[PDB]
Amino acid sequence: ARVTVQDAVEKIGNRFDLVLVAARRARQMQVGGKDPLVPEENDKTTVIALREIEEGLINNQILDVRERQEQQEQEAAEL
Amino acid sequence: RSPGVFFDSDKGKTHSSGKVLYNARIIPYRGSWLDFEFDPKDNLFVRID
Amino acid sequence: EEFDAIKIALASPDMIRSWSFGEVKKPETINYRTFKPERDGLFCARIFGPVKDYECLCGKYKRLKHRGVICEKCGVEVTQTKVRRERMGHIELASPTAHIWFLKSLPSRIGLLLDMPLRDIERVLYFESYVVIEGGMTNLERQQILTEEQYLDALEEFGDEFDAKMGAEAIQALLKSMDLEQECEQLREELNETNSETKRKKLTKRIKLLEAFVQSGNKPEWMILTVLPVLPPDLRPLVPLDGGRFATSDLNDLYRRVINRNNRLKRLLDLAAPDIIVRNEKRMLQEAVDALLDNGRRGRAITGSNKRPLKSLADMIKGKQGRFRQNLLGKRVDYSGRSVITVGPYLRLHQCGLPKKMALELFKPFIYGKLELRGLATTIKAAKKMVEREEAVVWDILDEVIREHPVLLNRAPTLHRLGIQAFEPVLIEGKAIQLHPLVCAAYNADFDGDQMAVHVPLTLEAQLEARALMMSTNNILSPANGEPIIVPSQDVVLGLYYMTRDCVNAKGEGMVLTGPKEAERLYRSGLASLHARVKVRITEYEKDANGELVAKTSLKDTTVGRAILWMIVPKGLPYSIVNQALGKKAISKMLNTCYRILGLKPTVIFADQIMYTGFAYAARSGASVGIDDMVIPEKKHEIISEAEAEVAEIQEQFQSGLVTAGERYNKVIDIWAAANDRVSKAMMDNLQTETVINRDGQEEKQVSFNSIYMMADSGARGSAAQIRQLAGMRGLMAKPDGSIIETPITANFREGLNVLQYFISTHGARKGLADTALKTANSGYLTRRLVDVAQDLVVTEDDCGTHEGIMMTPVIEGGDVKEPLRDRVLGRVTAEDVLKPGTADILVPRNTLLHEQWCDLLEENSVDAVKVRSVVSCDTDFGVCAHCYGRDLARGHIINKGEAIGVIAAQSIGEPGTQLTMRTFHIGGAASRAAAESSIQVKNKGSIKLSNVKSVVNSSGKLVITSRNTELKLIDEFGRTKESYKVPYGAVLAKGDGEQVAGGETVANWDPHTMPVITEVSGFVRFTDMIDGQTITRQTDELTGLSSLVVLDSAERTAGGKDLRPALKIVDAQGNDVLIPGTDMPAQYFLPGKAIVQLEDGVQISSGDTLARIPQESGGTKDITGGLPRVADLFEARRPKEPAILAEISGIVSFGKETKGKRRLVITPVDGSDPYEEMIPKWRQLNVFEGERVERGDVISDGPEAPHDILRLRGVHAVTRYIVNEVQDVYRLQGVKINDKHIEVIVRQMLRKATIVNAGSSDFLEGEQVEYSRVKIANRELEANGKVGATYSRDLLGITKASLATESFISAASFQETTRVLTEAAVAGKRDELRGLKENVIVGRLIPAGTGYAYHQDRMRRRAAG
Amino acid sequence: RVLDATQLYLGEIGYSPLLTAEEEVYFARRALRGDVASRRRMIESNLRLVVKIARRYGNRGLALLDLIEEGNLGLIRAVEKFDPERGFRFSTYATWWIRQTIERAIMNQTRTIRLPIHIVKELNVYLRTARELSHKLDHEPSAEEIAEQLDKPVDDVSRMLRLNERGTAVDTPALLDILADEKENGPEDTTQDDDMKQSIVKWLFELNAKQREVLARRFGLLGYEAATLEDVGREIGLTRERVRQIQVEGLRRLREILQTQGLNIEALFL
Amino acid sequence: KSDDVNGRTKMYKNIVDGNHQMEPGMPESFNVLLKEIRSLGINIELEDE
DNA sequence: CTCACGTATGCTATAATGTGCTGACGCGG
DNA sequence: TCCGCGTCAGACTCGTTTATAGCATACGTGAG
RNA sequence: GAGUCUG
Ligand SMILES: [Mg+2]
Ligand SMILES: [Mg+2]
């Protein structure tokens, strides 16, 4: 969160993986312009990803599943 | 160090024998140094310069 | 480009030509007038490339349009100027030149290859003497040196059919002719026939060299240089200073030397010069090349302009300053700043004051970026000018960027990881950085001008690693020991102490309040003191069996102050935490408790609250320091005059004859040391209480609110030791030698020192200050050796599934339990289902983390010994398992896989040493030691337990001990060990084995000064070999004449007595030898250096008597100065000068041969029929007697144990525990808490390699040293498939060698000895696949650990396919 | 333990024969006729003379050995061009040659930036003059004072004394880390050029089609070669007045595009 | 932040572009080290994947 | 297309022919 | 006897001496 | 490099 990132560590577990997953999500919002699930509330992309992880919306597995979905929709459109 | 003579001694250091080897050093203001020293076998040696 | 590995090998002449883009023929640099490169000179554009981007020299082609267009006229390629940093050239040498690195670098490769001494080769190289290359006529064989005149003789007689030459041509020919294959076979044949012990090593080493030479595909001729490479220009630049002058690299002077002499050699060869002159020029050419490669190795280095030796190629790589340590293992960095630090008490723990102008500059690109997205800046140049003008809208944008962006603060020195922390910055007007108080501990930050580095994490990844891993809030516990580093100090402690501590009645004694709110209202209203005793109603919130909190309300007597502190206290904690008077010791426990019950965010908030309230009440209090606050005891002068007439009486007894310099030194130091304690204890009784306050009626005693006493008792700042020097007696001061001055300082600082006392103080002071400057270096060098050795160690696996572990017992040294088993096995994976006493039901499982709850259960059952899983016994190859390690002490839970454990271990061992160097030294003046280790007095009743003890009964009735290792223990009723007590040799025991003693009984007395030589047998005393002047010395007295004998050692002894061992021999009335009860040994006690015997020969002794007093001068001071070398000796695995002997194999022993006195102890085991026979010195006396069934590693001799011998016989857990305990002894003496698991990491790295016997299916054969992990891998596949089974033996490597033995040469080179490392790697054709951290940091890649472990493991699986 | 290259060489020279007058004449006649041994013996016997000149020529440029070797080159030319028919001794003639070759080498090799003998000879006269001035003027020579004495140009004297300014090793008293790379632009400056170059492409697709076809093909922005007002005629324009009117017309509309986007005077300072 | 020449300019551009992405390269100090070891006559090559 | 300008290699004749700073750290392998 | 090691950043300032023949032909490129 | 410093 804002102050401390302990809760978000408790969701995923490995501090190292927390950082990778929050990074990947922050990159989506930074580049892709992906809409945030929680109200922004004037928060930087680093903190929003940690909010989403804390509440348990964002996760390595979930991100991978939606990557496949958008990627297969694009394959459908190309063919 | 003032020019003159100085008498010093390695307090052990060399040879775990632990022999105190005494030495004289003659220091001039200008010139080569004149050393006298003992060896573990009590032989007096000269080192010029 | 992205590559797998790096390989190093010898450069072929033709290889060197490949890199070259031309031969530089001329020394010409540039033209003095048109400052452009000369023709075929050192900066030739035709060779190295164009001076300006896409422009030829004569200027015919310009602009990016012309690409690779080599101008016909001048001969310059139109490409970027960048090329001149990458393109190399070469030099055609007239004479072959030896490469210094393979010649001079020890051992040397050219010498070892030819089996020819260096001296011989050099005589050949400087053209003093010829060497034979080959003579079919065995007349002259191979490598036989001939002088000038020796060459004339054979030349007439044989000539022609024998080939002998001079200089590097000769050695190159000798190298070309040598057949690596054939010599390998010849050397193998020699080892088969007659393998002499020491020359087997050297032959096996040349065999390994020959084998490795052929496998590398390196050719020995290439050790001699025919072509010489030239470094690209920009890497040896000639640039114009502003002053119009030029400045150039020294490599240019060295290249110009080489070219001038080489070209002059070409000339003198064209001119057919006489050979004396050709020779001189060939010598000078080799001198110039050797200066260019490595200047200073080939003798006197070539001095340039000042007199300083020119910096050569090797010098730019080698030194710490080389390129490794300076530009590659660490660098200067962008988006970095610094300034003075100052307090920010208003800050929360996760914040820091960052000056406006500093932050403006650091976040420049981030501002530019937002400015363009708002469309306030049209482009970058306009954004820059808006910032330069510092416009009002820019501040608002900068405020927006810094929001939730973490910044790294760093303080030198960075001893441990908390020397870098991340904060959220708070923009502040003013030039100073504002630091949060509670983290000042981790930085060792005090605001008397210290500065800090600021660094901006740029990427989203770096921001997240700073916020999650490196944030202040998230790094609360020390990674070294489990404790919180974020701990109140100074003002905060003093304030909370002032609030909690109670006074008699005061305002509003015995009132009643509704909650802490009525209390705060009362205090602030001015109707109640904070120290009033008062009954208040507080509602504590205690955790239940689940996550739900239970609420409990009850009336408890407290002060007003403690009630108000309860308001800060989070729900969950008991009221009993605040109900005591709080000091720093209690507050640290408070925050740890809160962390383990409630969690991180609550403790973070609670910590800030404590800091705010602590400062707030500290200031309300108005506590200060007057001179009357320093109270001198009324009874100082008495204690001192008593002590002073006493020491005077011993000085008068010194001229009389009962005293050596050492004895009286000890006696005077003991008298003053006890006087100092007495005066200090007088001051502290008089000061600590001596508060006469009238309670509600009559007088009472309570604790003093004297300012300095409160400061000391709270632990806010000074200790009792400092206040001794203020108000009591300053004490005995210690000289820079460590030896203590005989005259103590009687006075204190309130009293004021006189000129002599002050001058005498200076010695200790200045030695302290010099110690911080000079000794810090060795501490830091130890940190760096540790780090290099344990860089690779990373958590690789979760559970290796091992049962193996080391039995950890509770350390109970010096009566009072030093370190409890609970804390020692707190946060370590258990192993073997360990239940309760009654073996009928499992209590604890196998793989289970020892939490505070499990540990509390352990204490109710009183478990003494527990096998726990350790790093050393972990089976994981190329790292360690989360379970073997246990809890990340810094996090307070199980370690995360990917964490770089080794680094944390090395840092955490290294830090205290380096900090305690500067710390204890500037802060103390005198040495307040206590040597009174005479009598053991037992604290609690029990029965005496003596393990390992062999004592003889003396005529007094008393048990006089004659064992070396003696451990007196105090057993209770149930039968647990609770107190220990190291009894020495020469001790009188009050009671014997297994006898009852009451509380406060003395059980053993011994003299500390003098270790006596105590005889077992009774009879007459004989002087063997004790010739006066030869071995001893005679010193006579007056009137009657008491002579005393002093045993001069071999140090003062004459050549005549060297071979004689002097010993007091026990004969009987007949003058026959008395035997030692039950053995064949005749009594004889070998007297060491300066053994001062009183009683002259022929004196009837009884048994148990003191023969001889060897003086035991303990000139050691209690500091890390003496301690750290012990630690460094342990980690470096040094054999002591007198190792104690151990039995190699179990089985039954009798004596065989003797060399005069030298024992040849013959072990003849029971099952194992082969004997093991040892030569032993005569004077070294055995603990064991004769036929005993002793196991592997039973102690035979008196002496310290070598870690090598422990490992080799007992094994891993034995040697690991020996190191852990012997190191920890030192750090514990200085009050330093480091967890054993860190030391265990480094010992694992020590036990990395193993020697092998026999062959398997790979290339092992006799005695190759290979890493343990790799031979285990082989053994796993071998045992499944079969093939030749391989016996192994683990080897200990001490730190420096262990780091050089790593199979990465990039780590070995970066560490030390870079020249030697690269020659050995170059000759072996070694390939570094970059597994380690240092390797990846050098190439600037992702670390294989922490964040990088995810990515790195993805690359390793990309090696399996695509 | 004779390890030193110098002491080894001087040992070898001492081991030589010393020549007389009649011996010099006999060997010299055979030497010019082209005797192998005669040339070698005359050279080897006269090495000691080179050492004598080399000994009083140290601490000026090269090392003793360096001068000893270059001096030896003079000895060889001396033996080649010696006249035994002239009664006058060899030692006298050789001394010239040995000093000539040593001096010439010391004038070339010594100086990092290779200084031509012409300038070096001029420099000699300037410095000798400075010495005589210093003896009588208690102070040291000024540039103008030296120029007055030689009747030469002040600028010429200053250029010469500037070339006398020797350069010390940059790595030696480090200086390398103080002195920044002037040719390499900071990422700040390089990023600014990227912004300009990118804006130009967008600015090219914002003006007239014939206003960005002669404005860019002139500066070499889109085209391949940077042409001039007169050279734009090679494409299709084929005009001199109409090219100059249209070049400036493209720039005037673009000046208003920088005044409205918000640069102009903002990007004028820079 | 230090040597990587292309990397530092590219990342500057990204930070003004607001990408906050690294795009790393090869540190120029290491390129020098290689050149300095080859100047010693030791072949030190990068072996590819 | 020719000369000046910048740079380089050349020769000179009493006889002379053999050198020449800074020292002292301390522990280990 | 030799050679290898000996905390980590920061601030500033200074500093870069020597004598070396003159003159004629020869070798080579640039400018008008 | 030789300095005088600040931790
Ligand atoms: Mg300080
Ligand atoms: Mg301080």
Ligand SMILES: [Zn+2]
């Ligand atoms: Zn050109």
